[PDB]
Write a protein that binds this ligand. Sequence first.
Ligand SMILES: Nc1ncnc2c1ncn2[C@@H]1O[C@H](COP(=O)(O)OP(=O)(O)OP(=O)(O)O)[C@@H](O)[C@H]1O
Ligand SMILES: Nc1ncnc2c1ncn2[C@@H]1O[C@H](COP(=O)(O)OP(=O)(O)OP(=O)(O)O)[C@@H](O)[C@H]1O
Ligand SMILES: [Mg+2]
Ligand SMILES: [Mg+2]
Lengths: 222, 222, 303, 301, 77
Amino acid sequence: MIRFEQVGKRYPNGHVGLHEVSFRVHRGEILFVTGHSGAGKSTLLRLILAMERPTSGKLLLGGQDLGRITTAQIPFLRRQIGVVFQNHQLLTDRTVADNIALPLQILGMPKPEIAKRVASALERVNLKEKGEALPSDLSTGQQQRVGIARAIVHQPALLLADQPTGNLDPRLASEIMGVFEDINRLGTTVLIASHDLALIARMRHRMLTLQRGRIIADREDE
Amino acid sequence: MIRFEQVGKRYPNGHVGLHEVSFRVHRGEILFVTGHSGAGKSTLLRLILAMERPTSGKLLLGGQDLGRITTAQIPFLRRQIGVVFQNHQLLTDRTVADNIALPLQILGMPKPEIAKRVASALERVNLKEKGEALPSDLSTGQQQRVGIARAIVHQPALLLADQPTGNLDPRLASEIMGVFEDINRLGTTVLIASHDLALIARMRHRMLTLQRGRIIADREDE
Amino acid sequence: SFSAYLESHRASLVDSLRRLFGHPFGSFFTCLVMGITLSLPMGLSLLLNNVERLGGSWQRAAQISLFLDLKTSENQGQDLREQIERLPDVIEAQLISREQALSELQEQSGLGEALKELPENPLPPVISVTPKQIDRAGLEALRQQLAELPHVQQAQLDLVWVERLSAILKLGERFVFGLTILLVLTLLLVVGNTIRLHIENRRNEIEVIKLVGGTDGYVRRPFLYMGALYGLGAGILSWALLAYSLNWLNGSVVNLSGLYGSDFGLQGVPLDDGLSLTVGAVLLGWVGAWLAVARHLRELAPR
Amino acid sequence: SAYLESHRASLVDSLRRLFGHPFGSFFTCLVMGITLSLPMGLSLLLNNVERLGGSWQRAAQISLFLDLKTSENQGQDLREQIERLPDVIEAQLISREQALSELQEQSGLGEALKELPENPLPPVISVTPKQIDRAGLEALRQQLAELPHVQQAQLDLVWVERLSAILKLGERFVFGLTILLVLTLLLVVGNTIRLHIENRRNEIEVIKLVGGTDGYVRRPFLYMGALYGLGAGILSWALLAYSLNWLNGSVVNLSGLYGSDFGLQGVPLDDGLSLTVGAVLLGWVGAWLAVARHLRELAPR
Amino acid sequence: DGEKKKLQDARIEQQRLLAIQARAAYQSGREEYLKLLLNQEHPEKFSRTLTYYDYINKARLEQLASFNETLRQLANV
Ligand SMILES: Nc1ncnc2c1ncn2[C@@H]1O[C@H](COP(=O)(O)OP(=O)(O)OP(=O)(O)O)[C@@H](O)[C@H]1O
Ligand SMILES: Nc1ncnc2c1ncn2[C@@H]1O[C@H](COP(=O)(O)OP(=O)(O)OP(=O)(O)O)[C@@H](O)[C@H]1O
Ligand SMILES: [Mg+2]
Ligand SMILES: [Mg+2]
């Protein structure tokens, strides 16, 4: 339902990041992608979001195609998918309680279950000392796993996330990637991008490798 | 040498970021300070940059004291530090060659050798064909690549940064680590913080560890 | 749902007042700008509605005078009084008698010790009618039908500036029409620039709530109450300056009218026009917020 | 000698940023111009109507009369005597014969002295002080009635206190509409200039943590705020030329009917240059106050 | 004698002349001062007319004094 075929985003400048991608991802599978600095995979995950057009090929996401997408149908698809990204920004000069609760007013839930879902997800983050404070009050390491805990809350059907452990301990990394099979124990999609080959060679990973838009560089590795 | 005596910072929000610390920094000494998630070493780098209040204790960087110093004189000290922070400080909608040239317009150095120096830095970081473009026209690792290009230029006396290639692959990062001792082979002090521990175990160096704002968590691995 | 719609409006309302309390120097600074521009077109319109109440002084010049003969009878005097008032282009016809004409000279320096020799009063009664409009050129053609009366002794007009009162009037009507176009159109630009630049400010919060979901109404809701409460702050800060200004200038007009023998002065301000002034400031910030956000949402459109 | 290349680089970036979305920046140029035409457009209107004062808003007249024996050299002696008073306008002398003529054509009879064989009418003088402030009321009339050879002088409806009440309402309405518009002008400019620079707040803190100074960070925004004053000073000069010639189509109806050659001067080059450089220096002060708030908001100590 | 008709005809013509004068005094003695600053007339005009109406009235007093004083000597039989 997520199969790529003959798609690639052309750039108006002198460099085009991706040439050709064609792959199918099975449901309920833990996915990992890797590459060098010239390789394009953040545009590959942004292609699933598609805030700009792919301008080549045909792509499928369920019944509604990604090609020729309308403004009136996009934010129903955006509100069911929880995406965090590496350029870390949040609502400056507010508390962190409503920052976690940002999509919960969008979907619409009553008040007495808003606060208990904050504390139930924050226990794996080890932020019981700071539950209601400013985003600038948090650490530079702490504010990524707040955004990771944003993806944990209200259980999205599709999850994308970003490159995690940007500023987290290698010891405390083992608890956050242990969370991602617990949230993928039911029928979701997990697309964690990682680069440390030591910690991603433990269990079943598809291990897609990229170099300058070349999708076919590694096998299934199962 | 940089004498690192007793200092402790208390925030006005009610939380103690760091309880006590005292180190010893020699001329040209290399440090690899890395603890757990509560260790405020990036706050300690903000204490080094003197944009935070020292609160309690005393901090000493160089021949001038850090404390009761005028605001009009401290960015002269900040000019000779190549600070790289994990939130990416780049001017949006500008050419990429000006992003290297941010200290270069300050110091009063002539124009036709600006273009020679910005061309000089881009093979040292292994980044070609991306010149004369926006910072939005780059890969996610590439603003880290032009971020560390902002530090290596002009050969600063004190190089202060944290966690290069946190999202970039360790195949390219070994040369990026391998650049850093060549800067350290010259008469420069490098106090690089690398949050990871697996890649740094091969290098023979001095290691420091902080836990819950304590002075010493683990002993020096010199 | 309807329950989720009301909670979305209520949470955006209470966040706006917490935003309004924050930055107390900056929130009060743009509130005075929102009021002091609005005080000019409604303030000058309140002046023009107050000046037109005083209409007896403007309709006092160019009064036509007719002189009777030596024989005086008052019963044709009231007959010619009501006949002119039946004809249009009048305000009111008044006639004073010979005894009134005798009396008004006696406080004056003329007619001193002269009625001992006079066997009777020879001054005829007069009419004094001012036209209600001054229209255009061609109002000198009323002279031949005022000579239609059988008793005409003098018709001493000053013929030059009766037509020229149609020159001074409608010069000022076009003069205030110059400013009631210019001050309204400079009101629409000052409001339309500051509200649009607020959308240009704080730009980072829009894309972080758009890629995770959200509609166009949810992003517009913290700015719509932001546009409304500054408009509500505009009408209050307009209200204190107009009440201070009308109290400041009321001493001069009562000094002129008391010397003129009239009870004229600057009137107060209504409550019905007061509520109409404030809802205009609310709707202007509401309309200006809708046109402001449409540029920024089209800039980051999915397309 | 690094200041000259830094100023030229900041100016070329400001024009390049202005070409980026040019419909938005030209929208801000029009707002800065039309409100600027209020205290300058009303300034020339009070600089226009002082050329004619005898027939408009000033006709103060006192009926000071002479005795029956009057010589004409004594009248012109008193004309320069009343000109020594600081508040007079005109001083002319009327004679015996043509004063008899003007009363005859006013009554329309022409039979004033066909009955009495001798002439009783005194040759009198005309004192017309239209240039008074008139605030002394009839006490000014009593002070100007102090002549040894005057007999009787009248002033119906007291009429200098009424001329005071016109002139007091004239000055207070002008000063009422002077202070109100300049506080409308100085707050619209001061709000709008400060609220451009609250946008793009991340650019200031990038150069601040790596060093920088107050002179470098002021340079792209001093040229940005001053050029909107340069944009206003041309467009406010343009609309003042359009409005004055539009009003010129109706002043010639009054000028020809009265009988005069009264033209209205439009956009003088001395005031037109001063209108532009007034707005340019206005944008420099407003940007300097705006950047000082941005230094204090994230001060390190 | 014959001098009593030559004063009474002079008396009735000046009674006609004062009647026309007081009628002409009622024309330019009623104009308001808002008609001033207006109609191409200097403000000394329309304000010195009434004080000239004093002067024509006071001058005919000595004429009426001279006519009445010679009537009493003429009435002696
Ligand atoms: N708007 C653009 N115009 C031109 N070139 C672009 C544009 N955006 C990205 N690129 C280039 O295309 C490539 C896309 O890389 P991408 O955005 O996918 O990041 P990435 O996959 O995460 O790589 P990295 O490991 O370095 O972080 C980059 O090398 C970049 O230089
Ligand atoms: N303004 C503040 N007020 C109170 N506490 C603060 C403030 N800023 C930071 N802190 C505290 O500093 C602590 C950690 O600081 P720091 O960011 O330097 O650690 P770290 O660099 O992220 O270590 P690692 O990168 O491996 O995660 C945080 O737990 C946070 O609570
Ligand atoms: Mg730290
Ligand atoms: Mg990327």
